[PDB]
Amino acid sequence: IEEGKLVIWINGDKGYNGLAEVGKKFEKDTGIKVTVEHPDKLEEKFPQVAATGDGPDIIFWAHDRFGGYAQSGLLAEITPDKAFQDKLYPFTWDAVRYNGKLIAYPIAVEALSLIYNKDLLPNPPKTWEEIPALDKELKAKGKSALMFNLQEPYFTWPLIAADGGYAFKYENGKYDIKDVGVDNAGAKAGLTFLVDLIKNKHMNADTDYSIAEAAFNKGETAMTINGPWAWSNIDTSKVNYGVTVLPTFKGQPSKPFVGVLSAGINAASPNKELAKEFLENYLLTDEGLEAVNKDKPLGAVALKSYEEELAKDPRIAATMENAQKGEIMPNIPQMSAFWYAVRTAVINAASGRQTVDAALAAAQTNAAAGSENLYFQGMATLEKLMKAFESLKSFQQQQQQQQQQQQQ
Numbered sequence: 001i002e003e004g005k006l007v008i009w010i011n012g013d014k015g016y017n018g019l020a021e022v023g024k025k026f027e028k029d030t031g032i033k034v035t036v037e038h039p040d041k042l043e044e045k046f047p048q049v050a051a052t053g054d055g056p057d058i059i060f061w062a063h064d065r066f067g068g069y070a071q072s073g074l075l076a077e078i079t080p081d082k083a084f085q086d087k088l089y090p091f092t093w094d095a096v097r098y099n100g101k102l103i104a105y106p107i108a109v110e111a112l113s114l115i116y117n118k119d120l121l122p123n124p125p126k127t128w129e130e131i132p133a134l135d136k137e138l139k140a141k142g143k144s145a146l147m148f149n150l151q152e153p154y155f156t157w158p159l160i161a162a163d164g165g166y167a168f169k170y171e172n173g174k175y176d177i178k179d180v181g182v183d184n185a186g187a188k189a190g191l192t193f194l195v196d197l198i199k200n201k202h203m204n205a206d207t208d209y210s211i212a213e214a215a216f217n218k219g220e221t222a223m224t225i226n227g228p229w230a231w232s233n234i235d236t237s238k239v240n241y242g243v244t245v246l247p248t249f250k251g252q253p254s255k256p257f258v259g260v261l262s263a264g265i266n267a268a269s270p271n272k273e274l275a276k277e278f279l280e281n282y283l284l285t286d287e288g289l290e291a292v293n294k295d296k297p298l299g300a301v302a303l304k305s306y307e308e309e310l311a312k313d314p315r316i317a318a319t320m321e322n323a324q325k326g327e328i329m330p331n332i333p334q335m336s337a338f339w340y341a342v343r344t345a346v347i348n349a350a351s352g353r354q355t356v357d358a359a360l361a362a363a364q365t366n367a368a369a370g371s372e373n374l375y376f377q378g379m380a381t382l383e384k385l386m387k388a389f390e391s392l393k394s395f396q397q398q399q400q401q402q403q404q405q406q407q408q
């Protein structure tokens with residue numbers, strides 16, 4: 001990878017130009033090309049391209065995926081003096097800490113909130129169960145109650161989790177890597193509620209990120225579930241919008257997974273020296289954040305000096321309310337598998353393709369398995385077994401036939 005550039009990948013829903021403004025200031029001072037890019041599904045791409053001349057120097061993602069990448073030795077260790085570490089809240093350092101080493105620089109705390117249209121809904125609903133009633137209402141008025149991305153379990157998870165669904169059990173400060181609360185009763189109850197919305201045409205399993213965004217912005221649905229990055233496009237559509245706590249289900253709080261947006265450094269990179277300089281000296285400063293937060297919000301930020309300001313903004317105050325009630329994502333390498341399972345479990349359940357009981361039954365077993373790396377060789381084994389057992393039945397039958405034809 002050409003030394004004396006910085007190539008940065010960051011997800012497209014994020015303030016990608018805000019950050020590219022920061023790579024200008026850097027270029028001004030250092031005279032270094034900073035190239036911000038946003039390829040679709042970077043979380044999946046990075047590991048394929050890492051150790052190559054087309055790897056990124058820096059990669060932005062929530063902390064969850066980084067332990068994955070860390071295990072595979074794709075991230076360089078970051079070694080910043082404690083004076084610096086004191087600039088940002090510790091718990092953010094905690095998120096990017098794997099086998100006691102730091103692997104990314106924390107940037108932003110992200111939690112989904114309930115974004116609602118203050119016109120169509122003067123009062124937004126305090127509970128999930130209120131919502132079918134509020135669709136009857138707005139179905140009539142040509143509108144819809146609620147629309148959020150079903151195609152990512154990030155958004156579906158707060159509901160599942162709400163009656164004590166969990167990914168991997170935390171006990172003795174470690175994650176019990178074979179104990180998984182996807183197919184537990186409250187998780188089952190969570191998903192069953194959501195399928196019942198789809199069953200009763202109160203929501204539509206088609207719904208992708210784009211559509212949900214269109215609908216709320218174009219004033220067609222009273223509610224979405226999203227994070228602060230979404231906020232900038234809704235300002236634009238001048239939709240009078242509030243940003244509140246997600247509603248209780250079975251009178252328990254919605255428990256979103258809380259990502260920490262984090263900037264890891266490609267262990268392949270020659271510019272690890274520069275990468276650190278950029279992130280510490282330019283991005284993680286009240287200037288370089290304000291540069292992004294203006295483009296598309298970071299929501300709540302790792303950097304304390306700035307977050308002190310942003311906290312007053314009662315949207316970011318509501319974002320932290322949701323987080324407080326939710327849970328920080330594990331950063332274990334198993335999360336990749338867990339995510340895949342639940343994506344599919346929720347798809348299948350909402351498409352009808354599988355019962356709720358059946359979908360989570362699988363996600364359980366598949367998440368506990370640890371890796372999506374075995375699906376091919378597994379499915380091949382499974383056929384091999386199926387085809388054998390069929391052969392066995394076939395033989396039972398030729399034998400029983402052959403015995404009837406000797407009794408004659």
Ligand SMILES: OC[C@H]1O[C@H](O[C@H]2[C@H](O)[C@@H](O)[C@@H](O)O[C@@H]2CO)[C@H](O)[C@@H](O)[C@@H]1O
Nearest residue numbers: 011013062064065110152153154259339
């Ligand atoms: O949907 C599963 C998905 O959840 C998380 O991804 C979030 C994350 O908080 C942000 O990076 C933001 O861009 O939106 C994403 C949701 O689509 C996990 O970080 C990710 O691994 C997982 O695939």
